[model samples]
Target: MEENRWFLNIIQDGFMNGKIDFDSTVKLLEKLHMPFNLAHVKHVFKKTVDKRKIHTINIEDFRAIYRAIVHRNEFHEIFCAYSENRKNLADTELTAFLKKEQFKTEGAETTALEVILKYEPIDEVRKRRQLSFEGFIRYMSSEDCTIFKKEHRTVYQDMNHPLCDYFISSSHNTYLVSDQLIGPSDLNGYISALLKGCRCLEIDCWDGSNNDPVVYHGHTLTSKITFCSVIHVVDKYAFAASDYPVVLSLENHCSTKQQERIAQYLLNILGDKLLTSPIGDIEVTQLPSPEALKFKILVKNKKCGTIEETMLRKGRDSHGETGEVSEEEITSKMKIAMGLSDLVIYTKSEKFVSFEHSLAHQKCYENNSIGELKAQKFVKHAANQFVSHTSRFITRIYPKGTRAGSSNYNPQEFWNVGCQMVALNFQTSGTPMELQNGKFLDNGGCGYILKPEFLRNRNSTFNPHNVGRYSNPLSLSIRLISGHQLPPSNLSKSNKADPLVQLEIYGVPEDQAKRKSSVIKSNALSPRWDETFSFTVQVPELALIRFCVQDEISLVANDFLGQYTLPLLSLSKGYCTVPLFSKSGGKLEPASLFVYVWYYAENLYF
Candidate 1:
């Protein structure tokens, strides 16, 4: 039907003497987003070229090679199942497929027509309002068919909730790009975190040689950058990725004079972008909404007095040590300069004594940061109390001081207890960071996702450990179909990989589960699993599903290939593709896991 003239033109352009070589064919396949491995390509190319008795192949041979490499048996079977003629799908047939397989109930016919118009490359098929096999593949590979819901890629959540009622994307040490102890303090750390929609950033401020303040990890060998430069970078890139408010959590170890100088730098660099005062004239009973504080920078620092007292003593310096000193020298009774303290209208950093103490004395504007070890203890013993505390007051869970390597703990544990700012080391990459990236990828990647109603309601006693009474469990079933263009493991001696798919559910203690598919030996390019993983998640709202691909080295260990993580609520139903990401969190383009996912409330099974 001459439908592949565009593809033929590409082959012709890359050809020499009206024939293309093996290398050129592989490159063409890559350019066309077709999946292939070196060994697979060699076998397919040798079979075609040996039959022709030539080193290079003509357009017909190239076409055959292209089809051989691009054809997916699983997708072909699916297309055949839907198409009555076994060649193409009529409008009604595509609609039936959309409704039955893709779970499109409302606008199935409209979606079918749109897919045909958009992807049906053949003019004859376009006029007939049908989708050919080629068009079906194109549609299946498109972003519309991804495992994440299309609506979740946008700001669909209600952002008008109090700041405590959201899970804030945060960085623990926003100045370090490497190890915590000796990493060089660079602006790239702050820039990268902000660009990744990290709304809360930690700045460890210490007094410098000059009147200027320095930011670095105290008592560590980490290099320092001037506080002025950090402020400039924050002001420039604060709203670049998201329009939400940014909180500067200051771990202040500076003199009163240096603190005032730090205030001057922030005021001069940030100007009106800094939130100098509370939002309204009335007394703030609860923290303001993120929508109400858009494009504003809030300082989360220790304040010496109330808002009125701080405003009254704005020009005065407090009775603290005026000379520069190390962090260890700074006492707990250190005084805060009124100039810097007055700027902290909301998010006052306060000492965390206990949940009972907080309930009795903590103000709505104050927040507390607890070490991971202590927070874990709270998670184990006082989980219900932790949830109750976090519902009304902002609680930040940070990495323990012992993590000098800057490795991150499982943030899901903290999130399960409804801790708003479960700060992690952004420089680290692993399951923890993957989970962080996944959680923030929701709500338009705006650095803030609204906590579920149970977590937000102060009166609701929702415990992470005991989820039976408060939770509506979900039965999630994911059929692992196949992988497309999976990267060959670095440890692999050959060009292919013995890949296995592992599905992990990270949530409450009762809901945590891990399931892995049997290895598909020596096939990195179109490894078929056809395995199904099922989990009964007790807390569906807080569960994060991780799809990890690893090259099976042995029964005990496997080499990491790629992984993807997302909140259970963001998952799309029916046939969809899960885009995999490299270890450094870069996108592994065209390398994805094809899946058919379906979930429903356990009570609805009747």
Candidate 2:
């Protein structure tokens, strides 16, 4: 994927620049053992006023520029450090191969812009990884790749990067500011929200029959919104006299081959400007056909939606305090769901009836037989236009839902519904773990969400610098997204409950009880900029490798209600660098590096 390419390019020289490098990219490819394809990904090198100034930088050239221009020395230093660890990795001995020296930064705020944009790509890739080349590039070229590309540098709206002060002084109100992860959901509104101090904006777009590319970012068609309408509004609002800088996340995942069919239908209405390319343009190719995407989606299918509803049904005891569903609450949830469902339907309306689809609950799992019966019955009752089936994340299998612990909270009660995409998450578990597992793909705990549990990784190094729902130190607003909207607390010290009965957060529940784990909410490491690890190794070539690190990490809680589980929290968005200075003075060639988790861990978690 383009994102994979972007990340590989970022780390290629990060090792040389003290960033972290697993020397030998080709070697990593060999280990991965996947087929690769070489495709030219031409990008405009630097935006200039003149349209003709744009140059398409191919993949090969992309590599050349990154390898030479990035922080080569950081990667070099990281490579040397990891080489020693690689030596002991085979034996699982972490001590001799790993060492961390801490240097305190002067009193600093460690601004969000810096951590999110800079201080990335260094040690972003794990010490041990198996990444394929060509297939990886293709995947990067997909949506995931565009997401990563959003972050490497600041994106400008016009071909030439424009400063905000310049645009604002000239009276430009409609603009966009987003990473690669954000598309054209709200080209103008996104910027307008920012000017109003809002934290996030949507950038949703789906391919239409027309071949012309339109600005948008989202799952497409949720609330009667379309890229055409969005672009039209922005175009009309934008100052014809002045241009502002903007970034876009257009990976071309829409329309598929069906795009031609769509263009034929919309042709005379939109005219020549209706499309500029295939999928968006009426006269183009190079896109995956519905047959292909359908096949792809089929391969990864699981129950659609999230598993939260099923889990709620299966296990957790509903506290008596939870009363029967009130008409008001049900109405509210349905309103949100309807808006979202309408959006999706509109976005993919052309293909909605043509493709295979199913419905799911919050946790990417369909309601079981009893559930499906209800859904199908409802559909029959609604007299909805098209036939909809109860879906699994992939397609064939039934979603686990409550038993598995996914909570997508999809308003439409399904996800990956019409697509041919299967499922991917943080971890797949036999039991419910929500964000811990890759189940719903929410990836809140870490980047990848799964079925059972998510890995405990606080590192934040995504392709696009921003656009994530939960950055480290998640805001009260962000934390409350799953439940409340950061509702203010109604209690004071006098109303505090006994510590013994209150829910405690941070680290493992069992381990925290035993005091081995660190509770960093009260210390300097609250936002945890400290780099650390712990391990013991006795590899043959290396005498010993031991690594143990402890740093303050932010573990804020929405104590407004004093709930046991943290409603929403954030880990720092960047990584901490650890200098592995050899104990004997001279540098050491690390054969391998391995470390033990607060508890023993393994690759199975991924």
Candidate 3:
């Protein structure tokens, strides 16, 4: 919704030879709701023309000047939409429109008059009592405004929460640009994930032909990137988008010497950014805050307490052979444990057994990987126990090994139980990845979201399994207005296609979701469906809504033009434009859905 629908059209029509006259500029400025004095306007015009060294102003130059003068994006979008090229909708026009928009009644007269007055300029030289673009911007940006807005608060207030109290953005396979079995493991994937605000990176390390360690999916035909090369990529772009701590989940399959080399390379490349503090140096009372651990890398790897070693130790201890071992046994132990143990400074990897066992045995900072299937089962059966456990321990759930094609499971299911690190395949953009991105887009898009208070409390009775347990419910009504410049569904079939708006609600009790708008026939681009659909959810915070604009097809999957997923908690009500994204998460330039969203915390009848 950053630009207006007729923005380009106005340039083509009004800006003859890509230039507008001073008189036209004044009119355009006034139309944009920025009423300026003629003397001040002329001075700005001269300065702009001289700075650009152009006799006449182009669209780019004009936009640059406008941006420099008024730095609000919301204001610019309002100016673009209702400015003087066409609809000079002043207070009178807005008053009538808002009357129906607010009260849903044509006779809802003076009720909306006060609302309109809040946006109008108090005093003007021209004595123009009409509402301006400034008023519209103020109206839309208000906290009580109905426009659905994403979170713009950049710095989180819960930066000092425990590590387990925050959800960390993570990726399953950070080096594979393709599927697990057939993908080429490139350095680009690492860079891509880092730039996308992924705080945790997964690397499957194995001993290569040479002394160097390599990263790739094990037991697969996927290509390999050298470990040091991958490390260099991580170090170079780790904090590019976010300065939060990065967890390097090292799945070690290298020799002792190679492990030592891995440690050395990490030290050399990351330099001071590598978090190499000993266990004793770190505070045992609580985990470091996201703010405190900014730009630091913590390696999460096993420290030689494997199942085999535990069995061996159990057998030895049962035999009463607790005496000190000889030099050979001590040397053998050191070779298996020393190198990787030294690298795993803050986060120690542990094999998960049972929830009860983990509580009694796992270290406070220890992390366990729960397969996606097992985690889902836990949520079904032991939801409360799992929730209570995640309150204290760091739980990581990844895709099962059977997901060879790099498919992803929906992360919201795991996140609902307060799982900290639920890794998804970053290269593959689908519903699952979209959910992951949407979840982390809150709290300043900093890859750290504080857990709900109920989850953070030890004695609180919060369970993911109990839907509608409380009276908390959300009702969302989205009015599908129109679509602009929609891409063709098929080249050979027809340019004119039947298009519809499908609004999918994802959360607990997801079956009751698929709400849609009436399909407009024979027009893919500029399709209008002034229809409204409603959805009621029992658990709103744990829900995500995906808006998809698609070409309706018979006996076939609908071709996707674009869609956007945002958490229900982040949504606000109002007239807003939802930017469209292609299936691969690429921005579909100038393709957007114009709509008005009405959000209700509970039922309307009540």
Candidate 4:
């Protein structure tokens, strides 16, 4: 145990609420030996306990305490049993009382019990309280130690570490996924494998026709089906069947002109109706935070759907208008659009329109990457038919390319003329260019169409959820496991190179660095036995090894890296019996391996 110095918050909250969850406090006492000199403060704590206006808890303070406690440990028993178990129930007014006179003397430190009795008595209450404050100081840390806290945060710190918890919860097991992995089943199977504990799910949507949203691959309609049909199935069949499963996504399959429509469609349709419906092919939340993205796609399928009814706002972050204009200006702009005849006239109450927000990849014309004011004018003119003038980009591309040194009116720019959100395909975590600009992206951003693969990794999607982190709907999922069955190995195979597995090892005790020895250093693998693993390995206590497997075997099955570390010391002939083993002797063999530089301490733990 790395000395949970941050647990002081629990102690303070306990006292602030005017009651301590004794079971939890006792557990903490068991794990930690209290520093000497707590006698004085203990007395004050008892004094305050009796004077507490229990029924008059402040309204906001009550909400805060409810969020911070009440459910902690055996609070239900300790807080609720107040009538019988408090005051008179204790042997010494302030000392804990055991039922049936039973008590554990195993960890008792001193004769403070007698003094505690004298302290909480009706007459000595005030005196005990005065000393209790002093005693609390000793147990938490000396006065000089308080300077360890940092600036710009809602919570305090215990030295440099957060008052926030560092412990990774014990995640139940699931499966991992790879591109080399197989067919239709492979993708969905990977989803269910992690859905067991995953916080969100994602799906791709596009217009089947020139403008109907279908949840599928490809920007343009294949000869196979149209966007309307896809929507029909999802709305009439899949959504109806799904039990309000999770969020669904609508990746745009339109041109630069689709901004208003895409934004509206996304706002109009965000919910579990897409995947979990009884008639849908498969179902789950499509994006961790769908509202954060600027979805400028064509309306498709029977109204597609929005999660408004469910108040499904998983992401608190949203893109607000550029500060260039004030609320009044916004009202004015809205009035301007509504009055135009050539405004494309989207029926506010219409339903079932869809399209992939994809820029045609036909290499129609090389894009001139730069901001273009004239091009923007061209778009406005073209869309506003009432003006009777056109500003289409293709018409002006040939002439614009003839000139040089331009900042505005270019196609290569992330946000071009008439483009509201940039459509990209793939993962964006750790990518420096994305969101390089802080809040109020002022003008625009890349509203990427996230690929399915990114949903399984913690680095991409999960990390963005941290406090102070910016919004990214395209982020990958940090969760490791799900319940959907995977495709058999035979289905998803690759002639491509072998996939690597590099994870931080855990299971070590405090006072020891990551397991290291002369010639080689190793950390034990954490999350032993679970199909999915999390957290960095500790040393000695945590005997984890960092290495990669080089076998030619198919990486189809779920592999346990944490538990596999222990099998390394197994009695039999084989190396850790991992499902995916190191390759040697030209075949699959039980092997010892290293991951990402084999045995290196992680720059950031899992």
Better of 2 and 3 by TM-score: 3
Model 3 C-alpha lDDT per residue in residues 329-380, reported as the tens digit of each score: 1000223335345556457766777989987887677777888888889998
Model 1 misplacement above 4 A: 4-6, 30-55, 313-332, 603-606
Instruction: Find the 10 residues in a row with the least total lDDT in model 4.
Output: 163-172
lDDT of 4 at 199: 15
Q: What TM-score, computed on C-alpha atoms, does each candidate reach?
A: 0.93, 0.22, 0.73, 0.21
For model 2, the local distance difference test gives 0.22
Instruction: Show where candidate 2 strays beyond 4 Å.
Output: 1-275, 279-348, 351-489, 493-601, 604-606
By descending TM-score, how would the candidates be arranged?
A: 1, 3, 2, 4
Candidate 1: residue pairs that collide: none
| Candidates' C-alpha lDDT | 0.85, 0.22, 0.70, 0.23
Candidate with maximal lDDT: 1
Please give the range of 10 consecutive residues that has the lowest summed lDDT in model 1. Answer: 323-332
Give lDDT tens digits, candidate 2, residues 347-418.
111111112333322212111121222333333343121112321221211123332232212111211121
Error of 2 at 501 (Å): 10
> What shift in Å separates residue 46 of candidate 2 from its native position after superposition?
58
lDDT tens readout by residue for model 4, 251-362? 2333222323334343334332322111211221222122222121212111212323112322332222111101110000111111111111111111111111112221
Q: Which regions of candidate 4 deviate over 4 angstroms?
A: 1-204, 215-245, 254-547, 551-606
User: Which runs in model 3 stand beyond 4 Å of their true positions?
Assistant: 1-150, 278-283, 304-337, 468-471, 491-494, 510-512, 555-557, 602-606
Candidate 2 global TM-score: 0.22
